[PDB]
Nucleic acid binder design. Structure first.
Lengths: 92, 92
DNA sequence: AAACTAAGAAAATCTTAGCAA
DNA sequence: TTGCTAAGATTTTCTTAGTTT
């Protein structure tokens, strides 16, 4: 899990670390700490948690696991394309 | 990590679970077991290991973390494109 | 040969109780 | 308010020693 990806996505979502945690289902008593540990790279979330974070952040989960900046941008762009626009890439 | 992504990529590489493990730097004494645990979804590898696996399998690491079949295919295709080709999608 | 598994050892994360910016 | 951290409690993976396909 790439800490820069998590942080960038969180800041674009405009929410605090704690709020991101709460919305992803982490107990209010541990949300701030846990989300900070993830963003600072102290501990890694499991894939199930990453999926819940991605849901809150409105991103595809694999964005958080893509080190290649150009591919990560593609993933975010693809995310916002409608199903007809995706067909155009699919054929491509 | 998505066990089907790992299996599909390994089978395309034409290598055993053990061989994949050995090539990815897992000790010869535990490669078979660990690789199997990952592919069967018994335990998840950490991201560092996933990166080592992806290098052996000649895939971008985020393929292993992409649940969306259509995006996963984009990632696979993108992996094989040269610079000039990646430039034209980045535009598109 | 390759795939697979149990169980104890080992190492990781999670919760708690805060402090710092 | 938000970001951040230590450390013990908790939960996970890893190694070993195999059996199964």
């Amino acid at each position: 899990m790439l800490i820069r990806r998590l942080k960038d996505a969180r800041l674009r979502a405009g929410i605090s670390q704690e709020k991101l945690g709460v919305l992803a289902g982490i107990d209010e008593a541990s949300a701030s700490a846990r989300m900070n540990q993830y963003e600072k790279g102290k501990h890694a979330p499991d894939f199930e948690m990453a999926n819940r974070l991605a849901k809150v952040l409105k991103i595809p989960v694999s964005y958080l696991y893509t080190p290649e900046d150009d591919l990560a941008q593609i993933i975010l762009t693809w995310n916002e394309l409608n199903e007809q626009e995706r067909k155009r890439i699919n054929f491509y």
